[PDB]
């Protein structure tokens, strides 16, 4: 067999991230699924498209969808773009070269927000995963993992290599020590979650989920155990829906700054800061307009603390766009005007400029100069098809219909119809046939590129599907009207020639390649067949448990394909309505399935964002191909074979083209090195009267106590036998050394009696028969603290016991009741004394 | 999920919820979008006749049968406003009480922890304030810090002895905490405390065993008694 | 007396007598105490078309 690759892939404009501002209005940088566009904002057209490679289908491309980009950050000191993908992946791209630099891997989920350092040689990543990780790019690793974060990152601060003031999800917002790794000081920012963050100098504003927006001062010097971070006020912004982005832009000539908190909603509300001198102007005036209205000095100086929101922030304008927005970026300031570049999720850049002099705009609204929309279709393509030429591909949505070209890949015409359906080319490849959900049928041609005929009555309800006879003269139209309707075609209109009648919904429709076959799907699971050319009943396939949804039929017209929303695609005999296989293909409903022309093998294609490659006799996938994000609505296949078109709910068209040491032996290297170093410096020190150490930050003393806590008890014993004597020496010298440091010592005390005992009973008879006098000394000396630090626990113990005693005697006394009788005193302890019960034999 | 018969029914916080009462003298709040009881409200003992409500059902009035009237007031957001208050409250102590170890302020940190309730942190605090100690008891802000506690701290710290105490590797750090307590606190004070003596009880019992120990280590040492006088010889 | 259950449904308490609170403990400690308590107790038609 031959394999099938993603030969290109356009029609999108803009995906689900942030987009990024590059001046020469200058170009746009903007996410495209798994791909980066350059698009020039004044003309319109694609600058370059970034692609890493292992393009779909390839048997070196992977067996998962392509993660997609979720977030892009570039330093245009360096002309870098770092790019974090849904599998929490970072690339490294540069510009000029078009190539990936470097392949960070250090989260476990999508990247959030990704923000390089001044500098431009460190990044610092934010995922969802809920931890802030710091790159080094010359160092090519991750340098700190900071952890504190019970969810997803949702904002982040660190403009000094100091400092870095972290949000996130969970309704915290957390101070980070970049020399440190730990987190200082901790404030719940809002009551749900803490989405935004912004900050400029002290100033620092963050959104929760309510229109609710709090202030606060950054004293970051502040250093008092606390109040590093205070709440200053907080102020109402007008959309009641969730802030997601904050960003400020300073205005060098004026000093002027500017910020606007990106809603979830189509509405961005910008604000301006007010100047110190405004504030003290305002605060004087207010204070005339309270202390004419008469109030209390008091009450005045806490509604100025209750108004003080208000004296510094402006509400400047707001920016109502039609389609909901997903991001925005300041791109220009001046005295005379302010520029944003924004985002939708409908897949369309927008430009927005807003003219303004002095504290108020110009305008009531902004000014919108610059839009990309020509080369991307706002609604998810529903219907597609393919010409007989081979060469215009129409695309069919809600509310507008385009034809494409498929070399060049760029938009030819636009057509605005109904909410689209079900869209055929007619032969020749001049007119295009549409059927919207209304029940309008809609002719259009491409040469006069306007609309020629519709028929508004053509069905009472939607019309599912539509095909044509191979001769091109008779069309077929299903609706959910339980009709199907014939028209011909006269000279250029539509003339209905009968109806059927069926009895229940209809969901498709398919003409057999030589015409004398129709088939007709229902909700009712069943699929009717009938005699083109006499309309008469010839079979009912029964055995979908769920409506089918596609039908077709092969080209010498004895296959017959089922797909249906119960996951399965059941394969016909023609001729006697017998089932040859049923197949569980996909996880989710299968929406469209097509032969290959000429042959059985057909393609289907899913909501599960699969699209399968199938071998028509022996029934068996061939290939799977995994490059949508979404689910696959329609499907084509080219009349010569030569390649399938799918589009998706990503508004994307692609086209697919055919082509070790035991136990008393590792104490004695512990001991070897350890006491190496010890009478190291002891020599060094009386004479002025190693690597693996410094490795693990330990002192001699420490060290081999550490690996004598590892050594299982159970061989400790047996460790200590193995040692010849000369270690043992060895050993009491590392005692002796341990006696000094009185933490170590009482801290493993009972250790240190068990083992040091034992070597002196074990080697008893070889350690006395030595004259060393040194020996006699530490001997003397390991004995006599040995005593003090065990009678020092000693002592605790003993007078605690005695204590509790007392304690429990005088209690007994007040409270507890006597008996003068002894008998009666016997009765009343047995009854209070505590019992347990034990399984006996 | 009435067990009677229902006499009343209205409508509160507009649509989302309903109010009804029944013979069986239960005041029961549903959601009227899912049709689960919220909430249960049991303040009589009899039919409930009369049911009238004010602002939405901000505020309810019940009767009994007996004579028997309850007058309900919404509190859902004062609720929320207390937890908050006391969760931004919480978040601060915890700060403070992971920043103080790393700066090693041992007599804070005992604070926070024995508010807090964290049994790991208070723990380290005195186990490595103990450290300290070796090169009266703990140090002199520490051992105040402690004879200032009040009855129902020193229930939860002697809680935390007794269990420390019953593990051979962690009781010196238990020992030392009982000596500062008797050491510090009226002995006369400390009986009356309700439960202590059970407390108590069971720490006399390990606090032995842990002195049979220990005494055999004494023992057990004079073979360096022995060893040296062999060598002398 | 034996060192049991925690009182406080928040505490984690052990049979070695160490005790925990469920808020100190960071998250990959939570999962490690809940795996070991695991092996612990194992040992004992608009809509279709579109």
Redesign the interface.
């Known amino acids: 067999y031959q394999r099938f690759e993603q030969a290109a892939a356009f029609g999108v404009i803009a995906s689900n991230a942030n987009c990024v501002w590059i001046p020469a209005p200058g170009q746009l940088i903007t996410s495209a699924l798994e791909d980066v566009n350059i698009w020039d904002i004044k003309t319109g057209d694609l600058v370059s498209k970034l692609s890493d490679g292992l393009p779909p289908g390839a048997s070196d491309a992977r067996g998962a969808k392509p993660a997609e980009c979720t977030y892009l950050e570039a330093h245009k000191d360096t002309d870098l773009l770092a790019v974090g993908y849904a599998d929490g992946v970072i690339k490294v791209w540069d510009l000029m070269s078009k190539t990936v630099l470097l392949n960070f891997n250090g989260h476990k989920a999508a990247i959030t927000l990704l923000q390089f350092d001044g500098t431009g040689t460190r990044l610092i990543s934010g995922s969802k995963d809920s931890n802030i990780i710091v790159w080094d790019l010359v160092g090519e690793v991750g340098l700190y993992k900071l952890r504190s974060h019970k969810d997803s990152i949702t904002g982040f601060w660190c403009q000094g290599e100091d400092w870095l003031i972290s949000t996130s999800k969970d309704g915290m917002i957390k101070l980070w020590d970049l020399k440190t790794h730990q987190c200082i000081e901790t404030h719940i920012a809002h009551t749900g979650e803490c989405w935004g963050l912004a900050v400029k100098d002290d100033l620092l504003i963050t959104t929760g989920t309510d229109s609710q927006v709090k202030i606060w001062k950054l004293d970051i010097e502040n250093d008092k155990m606390g109040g590093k971070l205070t709440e200053m006020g907080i102020f109402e912004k007008q959309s009641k829906q969730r802030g997601l982005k904050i960003e400020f832009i300073t205005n060098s000539s004026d000093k002027t700054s500017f910020f606007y908190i990106q809603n979830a909603d189509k509405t961005i509300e910008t604000f301006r800061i007010r100047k110190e001198e405004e504030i003290a102007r305002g605060l004087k005036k207010r204070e005339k307009r309270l202390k004419e209205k008469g109030l209390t000095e008091e009450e005045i100086a806490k509604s100025i603390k209750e108004s003080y929101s208000s004296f510094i922030l402006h509400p400047f304008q707001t920016i109502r766009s039609l389609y909901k927005i997903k991001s925005a970026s300041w791109t220009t300031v001046s005295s005379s005007k302010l520029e944003l570049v924004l985002t939708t999720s409908s897949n369309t850049i927008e430009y927005y400029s807003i003219p303004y002099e002095k504290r108020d705009p110009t305008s009531p609204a902004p000014l919108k100069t610059h839009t990309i929309e020509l080369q991307g279709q706002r609604t998810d393509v529903r219907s597609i098809d393919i010409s007989d030429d081979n060469k215009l591909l129409a695309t069919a949505s809600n509310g507008s219909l385009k034809i494409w070209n498929i070399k060049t890949h760029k938009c030819i015409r636009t057509f605005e119809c109904g909410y689209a359906l079900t869209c055929k080319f007619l032969p020749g490849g001049l007119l295009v046939i549409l059927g919207t959900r209304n029940g309008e049928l809609q002719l259009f041609d491409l040469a006069s590129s306007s609309l020629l005929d519709t028929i508004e009555d053509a069905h009472d309800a939607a019309i599912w599907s539509l095909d044509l006879t191979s001769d091109g003269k008779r069309l077929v139209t299903g609706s959910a009207d339980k009709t199907v309707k014939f028209w011909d075609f006269k000279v250029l209109k539509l003339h209905h020639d009968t109806t059927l009648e069926l009895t229940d919904d209809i969901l498709c429709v398919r003409v057999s390649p030589d015409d004398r076959y129709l088939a007709i799907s229902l909700l009712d699971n069943t699929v009717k067949v009938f005699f083109l050319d006499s309309m008469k009943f010839y079979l009912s396939l029964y055995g979908h448990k769920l409506p089918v949804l596609s039908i077709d039929i092969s080209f010498d017209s004895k296959m017959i394909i089922t797909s249906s929303a119960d996951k399965n695609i059941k394969i016909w005999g023609l001729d006697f309505g017998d089932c040859h296989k049923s197949l569980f293909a996909h996880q989710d409903s299968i929406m469209n399935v097509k032969f290959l022309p000429q042959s059985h093998n057909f393609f289907s294609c899913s909501k599960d964002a699969v699209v399968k490659y199938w071998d028509g006799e022996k029934f068996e996938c061939i290939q799977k191909l995994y490059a949508h994000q979404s689910e696959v609505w329609a499907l084509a296949v080219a009349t010569d074979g030569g390649f399938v078109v799918s589009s998706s709910h990503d508004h994307s068209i692609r086209i697919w083209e055919e082509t070790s040491l035991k136990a008393g032996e590792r104490l004695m290297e512990a001991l070897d090195l350890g006491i190496a170093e010890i009478e190291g410096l002891e020599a060094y020190n009386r004479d002025m009267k190693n690597a693996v150490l410094i490795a693990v930050n330990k002192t001699p003393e420490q060290y081999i106590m550490d690996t004598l806590l590892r050594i299982r008890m159970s061989q400790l014993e047996d460790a200590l036998m193995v040692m010849p004597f000369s270690y043992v020496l060895k050993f009491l010298k590392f005692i002796d050394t341990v006696m000094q440091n009185k933490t170590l010592l009482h801290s493993h005390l009972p250790l240190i009696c068990k083992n040091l005992f034992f070597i002196i009973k074990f080697n008893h008879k070889e350690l006395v028969s030595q004259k060393n006098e040194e020996l006699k000394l530490q001997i003397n000396r390991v004995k006599t603290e040995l005593r003090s630090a065990l009678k020092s626990t000693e002592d605790d113990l003993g007078f605690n016991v005695q204590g509790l005693k007392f304690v429990k005697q005088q209690w007994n006394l007040r409270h507890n009741y006597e008996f003068v009788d002894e008998y009666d005193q016997q009765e009343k302890e047995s009854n209070s004394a505590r019992k347990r019960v034990f399984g006996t034999v | 999920g009435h067990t009677n018969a229902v006499q009343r029914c209205s409508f509160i916080n507009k649509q989302k919820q309903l109010i009804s009462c029944g013979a069986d003298g239960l005041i029961k709040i549903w959601d009227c979008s899912s049709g689960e009881c919220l909430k249960t409200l049991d303040g009589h003992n009899n039919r409930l006749w009369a049911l009238s409500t004010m602002n939405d059902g901000d505020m309810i009035v019940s009767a009994d049968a007996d004579g028997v009237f309850q007058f309900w007031k919404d509190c859902t957001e004062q609720e929320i406003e207390e937890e908050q208050e006391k969760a931004k409250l919480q978040v601060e102590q915890e700060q403070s009480l992971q920043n103080y170890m790393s700066k090693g302020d041992w007599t804070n940190a005992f604070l926070l922890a024995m508010t807090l309730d964290h049994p790991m942190r208070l723990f380290n605090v005195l186990k490595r304030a103990l450290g300290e100690s070796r090169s009266v008891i703990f140090n002199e802000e520490l051992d105040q810090a402690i004879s200032i506690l009040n009855d129902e701290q020193l229930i939860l710290l002697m809680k935390r002895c007794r269990d420390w105490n019953t593990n051979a590797k962690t009781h010196t750090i238990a020992q030392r905490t009982i000596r500062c307590i008797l050491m510090h606190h009226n002995i006369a004070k400390l009986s009356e405390i309700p439960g202590m003596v059970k407390i108590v009880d069971a720490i006399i019992p390990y606090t032995q065993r842990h002195f049979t120990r220990v005494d055999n280590l004494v023992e057990q040492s004079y073979i360096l008694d022995y060893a040296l006088v062999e060598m002398d010889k | 007396?034996?060192?049991g259950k925690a009182e406080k449904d928040g505490?984690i308490?052990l049979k070695?007598?160490?005790?925990?609170?469920k808020?100190?403990l960071?998250?990959e400690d939570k999962n490690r105490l809940r795996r070991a308590l695991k092996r612990k107790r194992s040992k004992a038609?608009?809509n279709?078309?579109?």
Do not use: H, Q, W
């Open positions: 007396y034996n060192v505490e308490r070695n007598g160490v005790a925990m609170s808020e100190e960071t998250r038609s608009t279709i078309k579109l």
